[PDB]
């Protein structure tokens, strides 16, 4: 269990690095966000199962619901970005600097 | 910190029942009704004193009354109990609903005798 929790924390760290380092794709950034979400779900589920916290077992379902809501909003914003430009490029959406 | 104290093999030795789960479930209701005082004494000590190391006498009494119950079953009438627990042992869940006839014969045994 501590080795697995270390691996899950490192997986979250990798997905956070993916979120922070952009590569030309808002969709790939959203994918990194949902990878962070999946890592947090697995961490919470493993912790609750190990500690037998059946009262706290609704917590992963709650984070999954709110994470899918935020993924829905991100996909809608990506649709609006694609309608604006046609390429979905984070470097292409840059015109608010002035 | 302190040294944890725990009993020895000599005081953990007991005459174990050596009886399968299907025959235990076949005899479960009459065992639960015959000596419920001893079993409830063991459960009361076990839930009051959370330490298992101070209920060993009550556990040995539970084993003793269970052994006496099964010895009475074996002495008085054994073959309808045998066919009843084998019919229970046949199914994958030991469902009482499958073999109510053998259950009725075993109940007739324990009502006529004892």
């Amino acid at each position: 269990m501590p080795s697995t929790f270390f691996n899950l924390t490192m997986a979250f760290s990798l997905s956070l690095l993916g979120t922070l380092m952009f590569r030309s794709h808002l969709m790939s950034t959203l994918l990194c966000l949902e990878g962070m979400v999946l890592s947090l779900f697995i961490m919470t589920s493993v912790t609750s199962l190990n500690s037998n916290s059946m009262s706290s077992m609704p917590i992963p379902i709650t984070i999954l619901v709110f994470a899918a809501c935020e993924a829905a909003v991100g996909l809608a914003l990506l649709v609006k970005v694609s309608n604006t430009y046609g390429t979905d490029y984070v470097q292409n959406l840059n015109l608010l600097q002035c | 910190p302190g040294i944890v104290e725990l009993p020895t093999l000599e005081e953990l030795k007991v005459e174990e029942v050596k009886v399968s789960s299907a025959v235990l479930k076949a005899a479960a209701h009459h065992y639960g009704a015959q000596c419920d005082k001893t079993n409830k004494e063991f459960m009361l000590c076990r839930w009051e004193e959370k330490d298992p190391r101070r209920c060993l006498k009550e556990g040995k009494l539970v084993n003793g009354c269970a052994l006496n119950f099964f010895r009475q079953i074996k002495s008085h009438c054994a073959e309808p109990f045998t066919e009843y627990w084998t019919c229970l042992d046949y199914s994958n869940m030991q469902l009482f609903r499958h073999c109510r006839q053998q259950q009725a014969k075993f109940d007739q045994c324990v009502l006529d005798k004892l």
């Binding site: - | 046949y90 199914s91 994958n92 869940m93 499958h98």
Partner: protein, 318 residues
């Protein structure tokens, strides 16, 4: 002994789906005022074997514009998911007994959809892309409907297992308590299996071959095996869930025979539907599900929430 059990599950299923191809061709022919194959075998029984040998002795013909890794992974994935989906069915004792059997079924079906999508995108062709997008729309609609249907039916049942379904249907079918759920589940199994009326993923008329248009023989045979195995499986799941076979503890052979008869009847019903009806449009399938089945199944899910509460007929946990 367990590997022998795996063989006696897997090999009869593969022979059953090959003869399902034979039965489909003959039933469609006899409904089309013609015959089926009757030359290759004594009564056409060697026709699927001849088809299989021809497909596995033609070249697979890897294309140029093609993501080869996904192009190879997708048909093997489809076949292994079809067999994995066949694993936990009880007749009346499953090979692998799962507590959350229906959840396992749903997960494996969604992964089979992923196999179709990856094949369509990897075979870098426009008709393959069209077939993949149609698969996306189709699985959206039937996934939400199927989840609600199974929720309500297993709320009438106890746990998410299938031996519990056998013990529930010991006295009476589930078709009589929930027949509208059975109708919507039959239509949803058609949509899951990508069968007529709304196949729309291998659409021979709108597209050329859909997602198989670049798959030559070999992996194409793998896709066909997966599809027809899924046909037999969805009919088998429908007769386990709704048309409960007679179960007796002393002998299970009559349970297996009753399950066989009803599964054969529902497979022939699938071929009957294919002979009878024309194709939907894939937006019309989404409109039909999301505007007719989804409100009705939401209401019926609410009704099956309320029913054991006001009748005190809450099923046991085990």
């Amino acid at each position: 002994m367990f590997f022998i059990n795996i063989l006696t599950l897997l090999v009869p299923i593969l022979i059953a789906m090959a003869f399902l191809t034979l039965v489909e061709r003959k039933i469609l022919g006899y409904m089309q005022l013609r015959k089926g194959p009757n030359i290759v075998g004594p009564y056409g029984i060697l026709q699927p074997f001849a088809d299989a040998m021809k497909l596995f002795m033609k070249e697979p013909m890897r294309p140029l514009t093609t993501s080869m890794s996904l192009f190879i992974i997708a048909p093997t994935l489809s076949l292994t998911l079809a067999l994995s989906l066949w694993v936990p069915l009880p007749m009346p004792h499953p090979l692998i007994n799962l507590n959350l059997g229906i959840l396992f079924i749903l997960a494996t079906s969604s992964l089979s959809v992923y196999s179709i999508l990856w094949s369509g995108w990897a075979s870098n062709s426009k008709y393959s892309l069209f077939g993949a997008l149609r698969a996306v729309a189709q699985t959206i609609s039937y996934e939400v409907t199927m989840a609600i249907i199974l929720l309500s039916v297993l709320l009438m049942n106890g746990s998410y297992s299938l031996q519990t379904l056998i013990t529930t249907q010991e006295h009476m079918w589930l078709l009589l308590p929930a027949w509208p759920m059975a109708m919507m589940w039959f239509i949803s199994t058609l949509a899951e299996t990508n069968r007529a009326p709304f196949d729309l993923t291998e659409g021979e008329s709108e597209l050329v071959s859909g997602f198989n248009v670049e798959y030559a023989a070999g992996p194409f045979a793998l896709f066909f095996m997966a599809e027809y195995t899924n046909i037999i499986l969805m009919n088998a799941l429908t007769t386990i869930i709704f048309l409960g076979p007679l179960y007796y503890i002393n002998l299970p052979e009559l349970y297996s025979t009753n399950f066989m008869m009803e599964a054969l009847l529902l497979s022939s019903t699938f071929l009957w539907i294919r002979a009878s009806y024309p194709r939907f449009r894939y937006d019309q399938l989404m409109h039909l599900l999301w505007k007719n089945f989804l409100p009705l199944t939401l209401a019926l899910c609410m009704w099956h929430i309320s029913l054991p509460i006001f009748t005190a007929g809450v099923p046991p946990y085990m």
